[PDB]
Amino acid sequence: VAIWQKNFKRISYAKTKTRAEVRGGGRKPWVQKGSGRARHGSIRSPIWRGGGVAHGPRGPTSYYYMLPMKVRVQGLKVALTVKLAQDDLHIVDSLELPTADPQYLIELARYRRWGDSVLLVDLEHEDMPQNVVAATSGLKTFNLVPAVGLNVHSMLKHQTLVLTLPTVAFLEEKLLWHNSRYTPLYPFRLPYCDFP
Amino acid sequence: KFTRSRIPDKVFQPSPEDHEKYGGDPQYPHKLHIVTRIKSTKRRPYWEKDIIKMLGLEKAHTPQVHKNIPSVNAKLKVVKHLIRIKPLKLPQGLPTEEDMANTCLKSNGELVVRWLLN
Amino acid sequence: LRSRVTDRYWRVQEVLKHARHFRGRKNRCYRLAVRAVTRAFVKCTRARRLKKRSLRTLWINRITAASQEHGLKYPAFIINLIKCQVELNRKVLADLAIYEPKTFKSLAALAKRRREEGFAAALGDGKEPDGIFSRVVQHR
Amino acid sequence: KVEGDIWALQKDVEDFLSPLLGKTPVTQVNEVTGTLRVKGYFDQQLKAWLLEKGF
Amino acid sequence: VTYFSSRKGKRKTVKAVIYRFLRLHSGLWLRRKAGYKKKLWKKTAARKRRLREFVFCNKTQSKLLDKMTTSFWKRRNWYADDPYQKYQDRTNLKV
Amino acid sequence: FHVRVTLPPRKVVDRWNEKRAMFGVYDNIGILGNFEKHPKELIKGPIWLRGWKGNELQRCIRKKRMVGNRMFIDDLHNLNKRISYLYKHFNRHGKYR
Amino acid sequence: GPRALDLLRALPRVSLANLKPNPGSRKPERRPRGRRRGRKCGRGHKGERQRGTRPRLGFEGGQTPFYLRIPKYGFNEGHSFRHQYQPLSLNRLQYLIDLGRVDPTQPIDLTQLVNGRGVTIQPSKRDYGVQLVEEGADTFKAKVNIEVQMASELAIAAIEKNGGVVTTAFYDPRSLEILCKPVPFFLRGQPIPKRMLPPEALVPYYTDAKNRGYLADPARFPEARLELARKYGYVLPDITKDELFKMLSTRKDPRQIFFGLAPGWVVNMADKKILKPTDENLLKYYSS
Amino acid sequence: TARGTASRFLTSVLHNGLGRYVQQLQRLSFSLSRDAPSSRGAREFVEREVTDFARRNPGVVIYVNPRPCCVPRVVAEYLNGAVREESIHCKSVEEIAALVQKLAD
RNA sequence: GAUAGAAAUUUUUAUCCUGACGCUAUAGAGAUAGUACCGUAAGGGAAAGAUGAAAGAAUAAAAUAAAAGUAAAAAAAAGCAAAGAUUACCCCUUCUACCUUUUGCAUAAUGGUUUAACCAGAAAAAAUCUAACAAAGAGAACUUUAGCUAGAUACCCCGAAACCAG
RNA sequence: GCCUAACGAGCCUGGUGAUAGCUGGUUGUCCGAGAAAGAAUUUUAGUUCAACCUUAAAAAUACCCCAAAAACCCUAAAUUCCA
RNA sequence: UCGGAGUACAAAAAACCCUCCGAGUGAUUUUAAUCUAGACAAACCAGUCAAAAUAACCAUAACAUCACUUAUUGAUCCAAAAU
């Protein structure tokens, strides 16, 4: 899952001109015979100095692949499970703070021995309290994301994960749905009998 | 064409003087062969190579004990020009279960039962 | 992503260090050094194999020299020393010849005595006369 | 979908299948995955065995 | 065979193989004996019957035809009153 | 094989900038979001390469089909020549056949 | 149970710095570099193989190819027009009913089977629906109002033994796609079309009471059922005086695709409403 | 190559082993890191069996330096003043023990 | 035959979130430039930069003194130039340069004075391995009588005489 | 013959990275096993099969093989099949 | 291109611009079918045998025969007949 997250979004914008795209090299530099030197065609061959690249990178390359949905869900579940098992997962309530000082969060984390890096997950983007929003807007190692922004890469990147109770319930409901579900006849965005 | 060779039966009919010449009992044939490959199997036909391989004589100058039955005597006849065959002699009898780890095979062919005791 | 070799200096030096003592351009030019170093290593292995043979030949020559100095030939000296159950190899024999002249003369005298006993036994063809130094001692 | 002592499950499976084959069946245990892999088709027999055992 | 088409970029199939061959879903390929309509007045009844009989293909020819054809011709077909539906599957093959 | 004689300026790269901290944050937008959006829509790049992957010939074919009507003259000529060369090489050259 | 979780307590933190794929999952690629993999790089000596100018697959070096010396015979001739019917075993139907995928209390349709995932229909691949086979007729113990396109004689006998109803109907490809995926059709925004009649090759099949055709004379159904029961030695159940007789006798009009719905209606699922045409010409076209 | 390199005759330091045997290893300095993954073997060696080696060999002074280093090293200084510097980069505890015992011998 | 190849019919939700697992002066545009120079013309077409905060700090200051080529420092019987060695450089003993092509090359068959920088294996149909779920698999269209989904494993460079159009 | 120093038909540009069964080249270490040719072919300067060989997987018999057995005018070394 | 004999002496195979015979069909009536085990040979394509069971003739054969009988022959595609 971590490699998939790192790679599917990658588009390499590397391109080198082949011997057919270099400017000149349209004629034989010398006759084939009698000159006493090596035989050559275009002066833009990969052998030559200013010649084109033999293979090189060819245009923008998209390294896009999509892992199976159940595999991705299992990866999320395993990330949460290891976070809980290694005592790096903490459940809070309502994610409220007394003050909007990032130093307050720094002192709280170093007092509770949470770790150098903390990722706070809230239920909804627009419902995050302004105090914690302003506190985490000025911090680098303290990163605040909504529930839909939870992923294995950030879970592994941050030493400590902080979840609210509504976030835990949301994750539980969203992740336990795939264990007893049919295959999609059509994409699940379309109406279903028991699914939005 | 070069093919296998059939050895005539009169080759393997010992003379009365041969028993005394080679130190064999004119009445009772010996029980076990000690076979040691001397020559190489290179520049020899593939059937001879295979017979040497199946006789356990892949390594040279390492004696191997075999039976004195015609079934193996046929193969020994086939590759008799690459091996040295001696009779296995037992002055002290077969090695017992308490003497398995203290035995040795002399170059002259007697398998001693107690070898360098104490 | 363009990748280029940056440790080519050390790659070249690892080969050029084995050719510093050569003659000509083989100690400087890498193209002429790689071929010369490979030949040097192959000759090193072959001469490692041949060193034992060369040293054995040298020891045999020294033993021949000492034995002929004692009025005895090398094959006779060796076979009679073996018959006396004296299992000293050529290296030790040459060491004794160079540094232990009295011991080597004693060994040569023993070998000559064993040769004389063998000749006497062969001439007599008698089982009951046995040489004093012709007796064989079994493992005890 | 094996949770628990997969080694105990392998022991039970080999004990159950030994009389049927006359020899200990060849098995491979994937503990990180939780999978038992027996050499041969014993699917129906193992299904019946698990039904009788209560799974 | 066109491994990469110029329009879709897909893999193409040669139509001669499908015009003169039939593939069972088990992997076997069925074909007609060559020369079964040529000079029948010149051939014995046994030879004519042998020519009329359908025959299979060996592993090399089967793999060749699989390479020439695409995945649309290796699918499972449930035709109405298919003559070869009973032969589509293989039974009692101990390998 | 001459190598530089001075220490290069050590790049002070930080692992906690905005991009590295929010890398791929919505990779599970669908799974955790009551499906409306595929992770395809988060890919930023050329129009003919958003949520798609293929070898060089397929990429060239797709580029010509999608944005070939807006390419420059020499760019379109080079794309056509590359398509022809790739077609010939892939359908007529190789070892495994 | 999961002792790995307790083992993870002693282990250090799981981060991106210590991640390993499964052994053997990724076979390492090998490049033509070095003493072993260089020097013609696995291509061979001169010829066409090392220069990559080999002929095509079917070529045999100038000999007449094997795939060309065989005479052409019709094997796949007209394959794209043969009717295809996905088989549905009575054993599979009983399995679905027992597991609750399909409810016998309601008339079983192709849409219901697709929703229960018992069958998969690909109309673009010339599938014309689902046929019934008798592979599990011995242990079939369900009373359903099945609705298929083709039905085996023994499967019909097995269903009538328990006291169900077997009806074989025809669906043109468009209506078949609509039946298989009704929600995409309802989001398409088009009125429900009429159901095309079967062609002349399939009219005799669907107008005979022996096959329980949907266009067959209903007066000949009891005679066929009695003949079937006498042939297979079972008493014909008193279907008329059953509690679920309405559900067993519910039927689709031969120009009707869904149950209850009619051609020409527009299903606005966003507002949960149905729009019905009222023009005389439109109504005549849709009911004709 | 013998002709390319140097040479020496077999000899002992200060007639070692004649009257008494004196261990020639004088000091052993380990330089490792407390957090680098390449120093894990050295860290385990120091945790487990550096004390046992020190008790077994009382004639050698053992220094341990945890410093921010990328490659862990061991420096063996002998009675001759000879210095032998070895790299213990990414080696098992058994390999570290074998190398240290070889240096001591 | 090589190969070519649709359509009917379906899917596609607005904007910012855009920069770089692209190059760093034989690389990246040919480019310091379509300029010098070469052709009557169409046309072809380059190489060349490196101190420092200050050179309004050149009786100027510090880092490498590391390629081939020379000098410091010409050579002393004998031999693919080296190895075994040795108190000792040679003297002693032993080894028919390297790639390529061939049945076979020290071959007097080809290639190279040397150094530095560039210069040549690329594709996932069937298969193998790993993993997810499993009579079902797949985030839409398909395959399914243990199968479906995903990932990793694979297929070079230079060279004609020629042909066509302007 | 001559048509801007090469004319059995000029030169430049484009097709063009033309095409070569033909020649040359093809860049790290170590380890395991390892091949000299029967048939087609405008084919013998090449390919496609077979026989050998490599990498995995299922099995059970595999070589050596005494009798006995394999043609009729004469016929050697020896073959085939077998416990 | 196909067959026989020697090379190639005794299971099979085995080459030469090696030595000799031949074939590219005739005559006659017994006008010689269907389906299917198991086999020979064979790179492939092709070539060969064949038990049992079926309808008509003795109610006891049908392998067409002879000319050294072995060779007397040509693939797809495509063209024509009446399928």
Ligand SMILES: Nc1nc2c(ncn2[C@@H]2O[C@H](COP(=O)(O)O)[C@@H](O)[C@H]2O)c(=O)[nH]1
């Ligand atoms: N066809 C074939 N060529 C071989 C075989 N063994 C060696 N060669 C060739 O013989 C040459 C090398 O000779 P070698 O080193 O074997 O004496 C190379 O051209 C190699 O391809 C073989 O068994 N079959």
Ligand SMILES: [Mg+2]
């Ligand atoms: Mg060009």
Ligand SMILES: [Mg+2]
């Ligand atoms: Mg041109």
Ligand SMILES: [Mg+2]
């Ligand atoms: Mg050219």
Ligand SMILES: [Mg+2]
């Ligand atoms: Mg330039």
Ligand SMILES: [Mg+2]
């Ligand atoms: Mg360039």
Ligand SMILES: [Mg+2]
């Ligand atoms: Mg040795």
Ligand SMILES: [Mg+2]
């Ligand atoms: Mg490879």
Ligand SMILES: [Mg+2]
């Ligand atoms: Mg590769």
Ligand SMILES: [Mg+2]
């Ligand atoms: Mg190689």
Ligand SMILES: [Mg+2]
């Ligand atoms: Mg090479």
Ligand SMILES: [Mg+2]
């Ligand atoms: Mg060749």
Ligand SMILES: [Mg+2]
């Ligand atoms: Mg070559």
Ligand SMILES: [Mg+2]
């Ligand atoms: Mg031809």
Ligand SMILES: [Mg+2]
């Ligand atoms: Mg289907």
Ligand SMILES: [Mg+2]
């Ligand atoms: Mg043709």
